[PDB]
Amino acid sequence: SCPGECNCHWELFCEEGRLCTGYRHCVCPPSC
Question: Is 14 helix (H, G, I), strand (E, B) or coil?
């Protein structure tokens, strides 16, 4: 049910209307 062991997602973040960036945000759910 999970991509890997944990649930990881690509988070698109923008600096309040300024340029945007993305990083690998992986969270490990206890139901996985």
Answer: strand
What does R_g of the chain's alpha carbons equal in angstroms? 13
Contact between 28 and 1 (Cβ < 8 Å): no
Residues in Cβ contact with 21 at an 8 Å cutoff, skipping those fewer than 6 apart: 12, 13, 14, 15
Q: Are 22 and 14 in contact (CB under 8 A)?
A: no
Determine the 3-state secondary structure of 1 from DSSP.
coil
Experimental method reported for this structure: NMR
Amino acid at residue number 15: E
